[PDB]
Design a protein around this ligand. Structure first.
Ligand SMILES: COCC(=O)Nc1c(Cl)cc(C)cc1Oc1cccc(C(N)=O)c1
Ligand SMILES: [Zn+2]
Length: 140
């Protein structure tokens, strides 16, 4: 579990969105596993605006923050899970690292701020849904 709080927005994994998130929906994309909803109070997270390929992510199944190298956002085939059938997930970055289903929502951060959240993984890998291209998160 986990979320990004930026301005008047809440960024969560789409498969973990609550009834409040859907009722207060701003934007969602099933192929990216992302959902953004409106908030009453302001958040303090800063979204990175960069092309960094090194950062640190939080792994709840280990209670640890790991330094990782990751690929640039891409269209990647992701196997069937409890939440989605086997499909191509877009804007996805991969790193070699530990991850379990309940690790989704763990933040990946670089020196510039939040890069994304844990969205896919298994077999020694971890995948993160990029949020650095969502420029509108920084305004209105
Ligand atoms: C057979 O793999 C099922 C599974 O739950 N693997 C998995 C494992 Cl180990 C680890 C993680 C972090 C995610 C994982 O899968 C999911 C779960 C929720 C959503 C998505 C998606 N966005 O397509 C992918
Ligand atoms: Zn950066």
């Amino acid at each position: 579990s986990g979320a990004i709080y930026v301005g008047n927005y809440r960024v969560v994994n789409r498969h973990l969105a609550t009834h409040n998130d859907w009722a207060n929906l701003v934007w969602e994309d099933s192929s990216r596993d992302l959902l953004v909803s409106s908030t009453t109070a302001q958040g303090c997270d800063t979204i990175a605006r960069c092309d960094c390929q090194t950062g640190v992510y939080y792994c709840s199944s280990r209670r640890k923050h790991y330094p990782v190298s990751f690929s640039k956002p891409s269209l990647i085939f992701v196997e069937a899970s409890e939440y989605y059938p086997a499909r191509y997930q877009s804007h996805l970055m991969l790193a070699v690292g530990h991850s379990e289903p309940g690790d989704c929502g763990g933040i990946l951060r670089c020196q510039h701020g939040v890069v994304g959240i844990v969205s896919t993984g298994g077999n020694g890998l971890v995948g993160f849904a990029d949020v650095r291209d969502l420029l509108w998160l920084d305004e209105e």
